[PDB]
């Protein structure tokens, strides 16, 4: 289950946007946690 971080939300926008929320910090992430 680690390949998909647990405090991270999968905001999959059909427009072609994959942004990840850290629902712990309320951090707006445009970088894939495995890409960084």
């Amino acid at each position: 289950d680690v390949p998909l971080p647990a405090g991270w939300e999968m905001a999959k926008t059909s427009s072609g946007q994959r942004y990840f929320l850290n629902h712990i910090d309320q951090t707006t992430t445009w970088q894939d946690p495995r890409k960084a």
Binding site: E9, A11, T13, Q17, Y19, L21, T28, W30
Partner: peptide, 9 residues
């Protein structure tokens, strides 16, 4: 469980 919004609009 609240959907936010895309960080840039």
């Amino acid at each position: 469980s609240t959907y936010p919004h895309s960080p840039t609009s």
